[PDB]
Amino acid sequence: NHKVHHHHHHMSDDDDKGIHSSVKRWGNSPAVRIPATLMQALNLNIDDEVKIDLVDGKLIIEPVRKE
Amino acid sequence: NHKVHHHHHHMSDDDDKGIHSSVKRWGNSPAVRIPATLMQALNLNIDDEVKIDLVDGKLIIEPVRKE
């Protein structure tokens, strides 16, 4: 017997409607507005430093931890 | 025999020194400068829309694909 009837979750990166935003132009440079809610969630503030890591063609945002 | 001598890669999220940035204040809002190099790499432009997905306490940046 095969359980092909049973699919567990739908893996679709574009389909999962996370938080839509828009990259705007701050001066002559691309800047996006980071949700203040997440700022709090990940415990970072203004003038903080984050680490942008490219991983498998995905941009992974890691904060620069200072405990 | 155990191969505890063999450690394959160093999994350390913070230690891996990707691209360090800083979240600055654009008006009264947190805005980070996105590397134009990556803009091109992921094929996004100014006024484009990106999907910020929170996944496992990590901010995952997925672009909103339009082919």
Exp. method: NMR
Are A46 and B23 in contact (CB < 8 Å)?
A: yes
> Using CB atoms, which residue from B26, B52, B54 is nearest to A31?
B26
Alpha carbon distance B30, B64 (integer Å): 21
Write out chain B residues lying below 8 Å of A45, CB-based. 23
Is the distance from CB of A58 to CB of B60 less than 8 angstroms? Answer: yes
A43 touches chain B (CB under 8 A): no
Give the Cβ contact number of residue A31 at 10 Å: 20
Alpha carbon distance A32, A24 (integer Å): 6
Alpha carbon distance A34, B31 (integer Å): 6
Alpha carbon distance B2, B41 (integer Å): 42
Looking at B1-67, list the stretches that DSSP marks H as alpha helix, in order from N- to C-terminal side.
36-41
- Of A41, A35, A39, A12, nearest in space to A22 by CA: A35
Is the distance from CB of A60 to CB of B38 less than 8 angstroms? Answer: no
Write out chain A residues lying below 8 Å of B36, CB-based. 29-30
A27 min Cα distance to partner chain B (Å): 10
Structure tokens at A38: 């997440």
Alpha carbon distance A62, A53 (integer Å): 7
